[PDB]
Each structure stands twice: as structure tokens, then as C-alpha cells.
Design an enzyme around this catalytic site. Structure first.
Site, mmCIF file in Angstrom:
data_model
loop_
_atom_site.group_PDB
_atom_site.id
_atom_site.type_symbol
_atom_site.label_atom_id
_atom_site.label_comp_id
_atom_site.label_asym_id
_atom_site.label_seq_id
_atom_site.Cartn_x
_atom_site.Cartn_y
_atom_site.Cartn_z
ATOM 1 N N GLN A 77 0.633 10.432 -2.226
ATOM 2 C CA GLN A 77 1.954 10.989 -2.424
ATOM 3 C C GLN A 77 1.955 12.501 -2.477
ATOM 4 O O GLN A 77 2.901 13.190 -2.885
ATOM 5 C CB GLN A 77 2.600 10.454 -3.710
ATOM 6 C CG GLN A 77 2.711 8.954 -3.729
ATOM 7 C CD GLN A 77 3.741 8.400 -2.735
ATOM 8 O OE1 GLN A 77 4.678 9.164 -2.407
ATOM 9 N NE2 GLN A 77 3.594 7.137 -2.295
ATOM 10 N N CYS A 89 3.365 -1.242 -7.976
ATOM 11 C CA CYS A 89 1.890 -1.215 -7.903
ATOM 12 C C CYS A 89 1.394 -0.290 -8.951
ATOM 13 O O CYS A 89 0.356 0.369 -8.852
ATOM 14 C CB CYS A 89 1.508 -0.871 -6.424
ATOM 15 S SG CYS A 89 1.535 -2.408 -5.520
ATOM 16 N N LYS A 146 2.633 6.850 5.167
ATOM 17 C CA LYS A 146 3.489 7.663 4.322
ATOM 18 C C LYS A 146 3.708 9.063 4.830
ATOM 19 O O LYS A 146 4.623 9.774 4.441
ATOM 20 C CB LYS A 146 2.730 7.859 2.963
ATOM 21 C CG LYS A 146 2.845 6.482 2.356
ATOM 22 C CD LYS A 146 2.173 6.472 0.978
ATOM 23 C CE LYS A 146 2.612 5.062 0.517
ATOM 24 N NZ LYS A 146 1.398 4.582 -0.307
ATOM 25 N N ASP A 206 -6.634 10.762 -5.557
ATOM 26 C CA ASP A 206 -5.784 9.863 -4.781
ATOM 27 C C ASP A 206 -4.612 10.720 -4.302
ATOM 28 O O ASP A 206 -3.739 10.944 -5.124
ATOM 29 C CB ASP A 206 -5.298 8.680 -5.664
ATOM 30 C CG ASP A 206 -4.193 7.921 -4.981
ATOM 31 O OD1 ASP A 206 -3.695 8.250 -3.879
ATOM 32 O OD2 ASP A 206 -3.702 6.906 -5.545
ATOM 33 N N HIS A 250 -1.834 4.241 -9.587
ATOM 34 C CA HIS A 250 -1.473 3.130 -8.715
ATOM 35 C C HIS A 250 -2.588 2.091 -8.742
ATOM 36 O O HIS A 250 -3.725 2.502 -8.969
ATOM 37 C CB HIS A 250 -1.377 3.746 -7.306
ATOM 38 C CG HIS A 250 -0.897 2.821 -6.248
ATOM 39 N ND1 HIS A 250 -1.672 1.782 -5.773
ATOM 40 C CD2 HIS A 250 0.304 2.794 -5.537
ATOM 41 C CE1 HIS A 250 -1.005 1.163 -4.819
ATOM 42 N NE2 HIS A 250 0.152 1.751 -4.687
#
Lengths: 405, 405
Positions: B202, B363, B225, B199, B122
Site C-alpha cells: 500500500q 485480511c 495494486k 511490506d 495484513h
């Protein structure tokens, strides 16, 4: 005009009791209570129109994007910026100052230059400039204070020179309540080619603010002090300066193109300075907060608050051994010490009476040092505070006096 | 175990209608809807216990300070960090990555060094590293993709060397749904003395995450999220690295002492990295969000979601000319293109059917480029989504096909 009682009935926390007593919240200078219109605008947005705002096709997302760009506009109108594109959404005044310091500061202040702040600044308008000076080899110069809490303006001739790249100054002090004469100072700075960053964290809730009349190059403030949520603040930069600033945070939404072999390009101001999902809920709440103040009328608030301040100053006259700090025309807060008791003890007795005041260095150690005290006690007198809360303060100080003296 | 219907009744936005139709919100990968327990925990905090959190004497302030340090602890337990002091409160994953990149990156990556990211990152896990490499003269190397949306791991031997200071990699891709084999990769990186930033924007909503088993040095994620408010996220750093990092933002609360003639000293980790008022309302909401997921059970969610995903993949098999991108074992999102229609048109028809999907580059421009498409459409299948929402997607794609084909 202003009905304090109608105003208080919008604020749910003012019905609360503390330590079994009725809360007299006199700490709005640290963070303000929020009216239910603010609380519920945020909550309604989450219950009904929530989505990502990155200019999405689908409906909710397209709507959320517009609600956010409307708050940008509304905030720009509230400070009379020429346009909505001169405002950057930040976490608060502190983040707004670090963004300027890094983005503008790195490309405009060099080894050998100087930057000027004042001895009354808050740490948010100190530290970022200290870090910039260390990084680039520039000097941080300071406008000294007078005993009365006002800046020694006679020292500018000696602080301003051709190496001065910036003046960073508070609008309104968070401890003294002094309002600095920004317009004349900005006039002066600009004559040397220096830009001016105005810290207005304690100005936007007390009276109207007009960045075009000020002619400040940068202006910052936070929403939680202006009856709004946390995590949201505003940084205003003149269009011509904002347009040359390079990005500070990188990531989603602030880029135009991203390549792993040809490099990245940037989008335009304000969006170049906002990376990743924004605090959309705090933005909605901040718009509600702005509408709620504008509907009261800043000039009615100022008037009520000023009269409250006059009432308070006059009653505190009968508290024995009270030291006040700051000018008589102070706005918003009353900074004081009671005889020789440490402020910490004074604020614990007050707290124990249901009275919330802030005690300590107030994120302004250099101002404590100037007064040669480690700390002070401080009361905020905002638009929802009353004569009765003032009376409880005075009485509590008199009792603290009798008991500890 | 999991009742999708009991779960949906906690989410007020799922009752909404859009364009006169019942919303099928399939865009939780961009931002999630929030359960009313989350919405109301924030709102109750503002209606009843609101104050400044800078470790204040008065009651409300002392209580707010503790509620916030409890959310720190709870978040640390949710990712199995060894302690609460390894977590820094940020605006979101993007800010967390810029903080590492600047604070750690500036003192650890030099001219001639290299940093490795992957072609599926991303922009939040790209841009900050690009900016660091420009500032210091280091090289940004990339792990390439395989057609199936998985990284070419055979290329590490050639990317890792003695100049490699860091690996920054996604846990779970936001477009492909691929889960990278982080533990083995971290093992490898560490053999070269390289740190690893994960990261996990998600990952945290789909299954349990354990930073001690991962052995990642930095881990980031956002609250919006994970069914929480906006403006709040978490950055986890190993205690030993966090303790040597210098401050990034400066200002109130992150200093120990501030002097205008003797300089400034810093407070300790995590507080050294948090300047000025925190988004206290977003922190309370994030704690509610964490309690709400933990009570559902990440393993029940994972299970429901996986079965939903299997159902979806199987029905989409009867949409003609559909291109899927990513591995078959994908988590959370389904990235696709319909015949030759631009995703933008596909998502406008879907939107017009009341179906919210994300369309564009997500993104992640380098991942679009890899697939040689300017954009893709993407559906999220989260814990509150249903078979019926899947059916509407399939039907809508079939109709879009018939009409535009």
C-alpha cells in the site's frame, strides 16, 4: 473436424516475420502461442469486469469471484476430476510440484523412505524431490531409460519397496515425446501404498486426459503450453489426500481465523492452498484457452498432429547424418542432432532461416547425459504447424549440413 | 501536473455501470483498475512477440528474455534498489513474504529466537512468520497499536532483544492508511542485528519509495495494486543477503547443473529464486504499469490523492454516527463504521448505489480485534477517483443512516 488454416488465423503471432523471414514457430513445447480468443478474454476482463476476487460484496468483485470459480470447474471437467475442489490454481507445473513436495512431502516422507522418479524427467519433476530428500533423509531412486527413449520397466521390482512413498513421473516427455504407461504404473505403485504424482505439462494439449481413469493422486500442468497465458497452472489432488494436506503458502484468503495470541486456523481445500490475490487475469485467460481447445476437439488435434508428425518423420529421413532421440510413436516434439555440429549452431542457422526450435538440455540434463550429449535441438509440431513449416525445417537442415559439413 | 479527467479516460472500467448505475470504484486498495496502456502492452506482447524466455537462441525468445530483464531493471529503478539483481519476480506481496520466511527464515531464525511484527499487519505479513515460528520454535512478538491507528513505539525497548532476528512491518496500513516511520525503526532494528522486511503493498502507488534511504533488507509489493496485471509482484533483497539465501522453489531455470547421482547446483541471485516459466505476460504489463505511474509523477499523484483525501474527510464530517479508524494523516483508504449497522449492510447499500467499497476484516483480523469490531467498511481514494465519487459516498451513507436508523 480440423482446419489447420482456420486454426492458424486465430493466432496473431503466426503472421509475424523474423530476421526479415516468415516465422516458422516450432517451439510450442517450451511455451505455446495464444489464440486471440485467449488474449482478448483476458483483455476484456481487465477493460470491463476487473476487481478483487476475495468474495466481495460489491458487484464486480462478486462477479470476478464467480468467473474464477467457474474456471476451476471447467478445468476440473477438462481433466475429469470428480470435483472442482480437487484443483488448486498454481503459477504452473513447477509451482504445483513444489507445493506437493512440501505440503504432502514433508508430512509423508521420512528419513529412510524412498521416492521414485525416472531418468527422463524435466527439472521441475526432479529438484523439488531432491530438496525433499535432503530435508528429510529419504532416497531418490530412478527408473532408467532404454535407448529408444522408453523407461526400463523391468527395473520397478527393484525400485518399489515398502519404503517407497511416491512415484513422480511424466505423462509425456518434453524431449523424447514418449508417453509413459501411467495407468499400469499407478496400479503398481498403489500396490505398495505409494502415491503417484503425474507431471502432465506435455500431455494436456495433445489428447484427452482423464485423472479418474489414470487414478493418479496428483496431476499438474501449465496454461502457457496449452495455448493460454503465463503465470497460471493447475494442480489436481485427490480429494481425500488434498483434505489432509497442511497449507504451503500462508496469508490472506487461505485462513479461517488469524489471532496473534490464539494462533491461526485454515480454510478448506482448495482455498487453503491459495494465499493472497490470485492471478485472476491468467485464470480468465486459462478458461478461454480451455474452451478454445475443447471446441477444436482434442481428438481432432491429436489426429492432425499425429499425421503432421508422421509427415515430418518421413521427410527427415532424407536429412543426412541426423540423429533422432526417442520412440517412433513420439508425441509433439522431435529431438535431434545433426551430424557432429553442436545443437547451438544448428539452432542458430535455423533461427536465421526464420525457424524457431529449442536447442540445449531442455531442462532435462539427466536425459542428455543418458544419451551422452551435452545438448540437442528440438522441434515442436503443434496443432497450428504445417507441412510447409516441416519442409522448411528439412531443407534448412540439409543446407546446414552442406555448409558446415 | 495532474489531470484527473485525462487520467480517468485511460481506465476503461471507469466508464462501466453497475446495477444500472455509474460505478464509483472505491476499492483500489484491494486491487486497482488498469489503464489501457497496461492492458494493451500485455496484449500486444501476446499478439506479436510471444515466446519462452529461458534465454533462447531463436529471436522471439531472445527478445522476450530481454524485455523481461528490462522490466527487472525498471522496477529496480522505480524503488531505487542499487541493482536489478536485487529484485526477484514473485506472484505478489504474499508470495514474496513466504519466500523470505522460508529461504531466509529457515537458515536464520532458531528455536528461542524472536521475530517482531505489529498489530496492524495484513495476514500476508503474519501467517508466514507464524508458520516459521512453529517450524523452528521462535516467538512472534507484536508491536501494539494506539487508538489513533499508530503503533506504540514506546514498546520497542521491551520487544527488541538479542534474540530478535527480524522486524516485519508494513510501510502503509491497508485499513488505517497510517504510514509507519520505517527509517527510524530500521535504524533501531539494525542496532540489534535484526533484519527488516517491509511490506509495501500500500505504499508504491501513493508516493516515491527509496529502499536505499530506507535501508530495509527486504521490500515487497504487488503489481495489481499498482495499476498492473495480476499474478506479478516484486521482492527486493539487499544483494549481500540475497546472495546467501538458498533456493525456495526448485526446478527449471534456477539450477546450474542437475545430476541424479551427483546432486544439483544453483544459479545466481535473482535467477536462483525463480523456478520454471515466469509470468512473462504479467512482467510486460508490470513494466507498462511502472512507466504509466512514472509518467504521471508519483509526487503529482500524491498531491492529488492527498487533496482528495482532505476533501473526503471534511465531507464525511456531516455523516451522522460515523466512526473513522486510523490517523488523520492517513494515506489512500478510509476505514469506517456507520452507527451500529454491520459493515456488511452498509457495503450492500453502497454497492446497490453503484459504489464499490470493501467491507469485512480486510485480511487484518488482529486490527479488527484491537478495535473490538468484527469488521469495517473501507473506501479507497486513488488517483482516478473524484470529488463527485466522494459526494456519492457521503450521500449514500446519510441515506443508509436515515433508512436503517
Amino acid at each position: 473436424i480440423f482446419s489447420v488454416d482456420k486454426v492458424r488465423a486465430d493466432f496473431p503471432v503466426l503472421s509475424r516475420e523474423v530476421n526479415g523471414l516468415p516465422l516458422a514457430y516450432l517451439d510450442s513445447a517450451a511455451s505455446a502461442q495464444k489464440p486471440s480468443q485467449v488474449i482478448d478474454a483476458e483483455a476484456e476482463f481487465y477493460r470491463h469486469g476487473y476487481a478483487a476476487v476475495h468474495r466481495g460484496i460489491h458487484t464486480l468483485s462478486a462477479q470476478a469471484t464467480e468467473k474464477m470459480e467457474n474456471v476451476r470447474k471447467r478445468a476440473s471437467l477438462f481433466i475429469n476430476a470428480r470435483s472442482a475442489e480437487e484443483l488448486v490454481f498454481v503459477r504452473g507445473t513447477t509451482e504445483g510440484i513444489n507445493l506437493v513436495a512440501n505440503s504432502w512431502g514433508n508430512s509423508n516422507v521420512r528419513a529412510g523412505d524412498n521416492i521414485i522418479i525416472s531418468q527422463m524427467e524435466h527439472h521441475a519433476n526432479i529438484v523439488p524431490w531432491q530438496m525433499l530428500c535432503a530435508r528429510v533423509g529419504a532416497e531418490l531412486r530412478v527408473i532408467p531409460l532404454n535407448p529408444d527413449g522408453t523407461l526400463q520397466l523391468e527395473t520397478l521390482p527393484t525400485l518399489f519397496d515398502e519404503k517407497t512413498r511416491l512415484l513422480a513421473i511424466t505423462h509425456v516427455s518434453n524431449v523424447l515425446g514418449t508417453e509413459n504407461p501411467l495407468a499400469e504404473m499407478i496400479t503398481l505403485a498403489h500396490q505398495h501404498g505409494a502415491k503417484v504424482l503425474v507431471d502432465g505439462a506435455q500431455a494436456v494439449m495433445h489428447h484427452p486426459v482423464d485423472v479418474q481413469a489414470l487414478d493418479c493422486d496428483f496431476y499438474v500442468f501449465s496454461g502457457h503450453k496449452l495455448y493460454g497465458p503465463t503465470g497460471i497452472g493447475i494442480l489436481y489432488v485427490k480429494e481425500a489426500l488434498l483434505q489432509e494436506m497442511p497449507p504451503w503458502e500462508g496469508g490472506g484468503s487461505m485462513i479461517a481465523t488469524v489471532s496473534l495470541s490464539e494462533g491461526t486456523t485454515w480454510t478448506k481445500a482448495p482455498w487453503r492452498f491459495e494465499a493472497g490475490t490470485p492471478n485472476t487475469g491468467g485464470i480468465i485467460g486459462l478458461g478461454a484457452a480451455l474452451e478454445y481447445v475443447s471446441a477444436l476437439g482434442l481428438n481432432n488435434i491429436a489426429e492432425y498432429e499425429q499425421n503432421l508428425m508422421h509427415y515430418a518423420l518421413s521427410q527427415l529421413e532424407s536429412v543426412p547424418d541426423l540423429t533422432l532421440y526417442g520412440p517412433q510413436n513420439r508425441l509433439g516434439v522431435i529431438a535431434f542432432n545433426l551430424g557432429k555440429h553442436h545443437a547451438y549452431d544448428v539452432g542458430s542457422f535455423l533461427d536465421n532461416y526464420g525457424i524457431a526450435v529449442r536447442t540445449g538440455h531442455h531442462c532435462a540434463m539427466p536425459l542428455m547425459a543418458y544419451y551422452n550429449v551435452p545438448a540437442m535441438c528440438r522441434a515442436s509440431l503443434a496443432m497450428y504447424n504445417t507441412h510447409e513449416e516441416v519442409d522448411r525445417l528439412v531443407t534448412g537442415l540439409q543446407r546446414i549440413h552442406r555448409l558446415l559439413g
